[PDB]
């Protein structure tokens, strides 16, 4: 935006925390909280921080305009609407992902399974990307270990395609 | 919105036509043009009208706010951005759809094919919905003629799932 004479309205919001990047991630590392909204380094916006895992954080710019907000190219009546329409279904998604039989917490620890490969079947694992916070890595071994990125929003997104959960993704990916 | 003292900015836009619903569809029926933006019946917005077929028109509210516009829950810097980001890929989609081997122009005329059913295979056809302008009807005969709606945006959307074209949709739907 450009600067206004009044405090940004999101300052008054209960989810708004006066944190920078490190403080947000710190606070989230040791909180039960899954997300917060922090201050942006320049005027006009705050930033939604969602903890994907202990060391995976997603920071999304939320812009404040005269009545509405915008977040990820979508438009929202208020911050509460960002949370219900946008954040909760992400969390619902993250919950399923980490419940999955085939989800692991580290690449390093999804390592064991990928190495157990006989030649009998494709071995595959899932773990969140640290190189691209917000991506789920689909890793598989068919002879060589390959990797693919899946987007994590309210759905799982893979190239053109879109999935409610890992299961349906798996179904599509094989056949 | 509520009323302002200045003309809505979209009046100045070259794609804006001072038409109501009938005039828009009329004009589109007999134009080579695929879409236009028309006046809304109340303040604060114009309406994108896309011709899907001779008697299928999709009307989408485009709201004008102080600098940005909104259309289908998405946010746009200007009307031009609505067109490139939103309308052209719809048109690219519509083009493919009507190119498809399995697309027909009327339900009535996708009737022949659905009746040719032997028992040898599932017979299926595609045609745009008139009951829900903006939907593509996927019709199939496996014993009885069933129907399903696919959304037409930049992608084809079917329940949870999303497709670039009919072909990949077909692939998914069978197996
Ligand atoms: Cl707005
Ligand atoms: Cl805006």
């Amino acid at each position: 935006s450009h600067m206004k004479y009044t405090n940004p309205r999101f300052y008054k919001h209960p989810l708004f925390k006066n944190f920078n990047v490190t403080e947000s991630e710190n606070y989230l590392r040791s909180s039960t909280d899954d997300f917060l909204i922090r201050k942006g380094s320049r005027h006009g916006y705050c930033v939604l921080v969602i903890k994907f895992a202990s060391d995976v954080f997603v920071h999304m710019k939320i812009e404040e305009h005269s009545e509405h907000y915008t977040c990820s190219n979508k438009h929202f009546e208020d911050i509460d609407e960002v949370i219900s329409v946008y954040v909760r279904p992400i969390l619902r998604n993250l919950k399923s992902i980490k419940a999955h039989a085939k989800y692991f917490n580290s690449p390093e620890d999804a390592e064991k399974l990928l190495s157990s490969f006989d030649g009998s079947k494709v071995v595959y694992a899932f773990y969140f990307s640290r190189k691209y916070p917000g991506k789920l890595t689909f890793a598989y071994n068919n002879g060589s270990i390959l990797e693919e990125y899946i987007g994590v929003s309210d759905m799982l997104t893979y190239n053109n395609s879109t999935f409610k959960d890992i299961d349906s993704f798996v179904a599509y990916r094989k056949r």
Side-chain angles (χ1 to χ4, degrees), chain A:
Chain A
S1 202
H2 273 22
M3 282 161 316
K4 289 160 189 303
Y5 281 69
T6 61
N7 299 264
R9 299 174 294 101
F10 57 77
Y11 276 28
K12 307 184 164 174
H13 196 267
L15 283 141
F16 176 84
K17 298 260 191 301
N18 183 34
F19 292 157
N20 61 25
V21 170
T22 277
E23 289 155 354
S24 299
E25 300 195 344
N26 251 8
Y27 171 84
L28 295 177
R29 267 170 208 118
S30 49
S31 180
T32 48
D33 295 3
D34 283 346
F35 71 92
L36 49 79
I37 291 166
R38 63 169 174 85
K39 151 209 126 94
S41 310
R42 269 292 179 173
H43 66 268
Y45 68 91
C46 50
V47 183
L48 167 68
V49 188
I50 308 172
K51 159 172 75 193
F52 270 39
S54 294
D55 66 336
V56 184
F57 301 89
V58 166
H59 293 253
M60 293 177 226
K61 187 154 66 178
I62 294 168
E63 295 209 58
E64 179 172 286
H65 302 133
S66 188
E67 271 171 8
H68 305 76
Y69 295 79
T70 57
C71 190
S72 305
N73 300 301
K74 280 279 175 181
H75 172 264
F76 307 89
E77 313 295 348
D78 44 50
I79 273 155
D80 280 5
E81 195 182 33
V82 172
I83 290 134
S84 46
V85 165
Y86 187 72
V87 182
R88 289 201 257 281
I90 292 172
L91 305 178
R92 278 167 192 259
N93 214 9
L94 289 176
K95 167 175 163 103
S96 302
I97 282 164
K98 307 201 224 169
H100 203 259
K102 298 276 95 82
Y103 179 87
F104 295 83
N105 276 107
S106 108
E108 199 194 3
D109 276 328
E111 158 192 352
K112 175 177 188 179
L113 199 75
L114 290 166
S115 285
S116 73
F117 170 100
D118 287 22
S120 60
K121 61 159 204 224
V122 179
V123 181
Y124 58 96
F126 294 85
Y127 50 93
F128 284 115
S129 178
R130 279 69 179 165
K131 308 202 184 202
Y132 309 90
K135 302 295 156 172
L136 175 71
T137 302
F138 169 55
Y140 66 102
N141 200 4
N142 65 355
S144 38
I145 314 158
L146 319 198
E147 283 167 4
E148 299 189 84
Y149 287 146
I150 297 162
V152 184
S153 52
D154 68 311
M155 305 287 286
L156 296 182
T157 39
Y158 165 85
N159 284 0
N160 294 309
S161 304
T162 280
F163 312 97
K164 65 156 176 188
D165 59 16
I166 290 180
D167 258 357
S168 32
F169 166 77
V170 169
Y172 156 89
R173 190 62 186 82
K174 70 193 198 144
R175 204 93 171 175

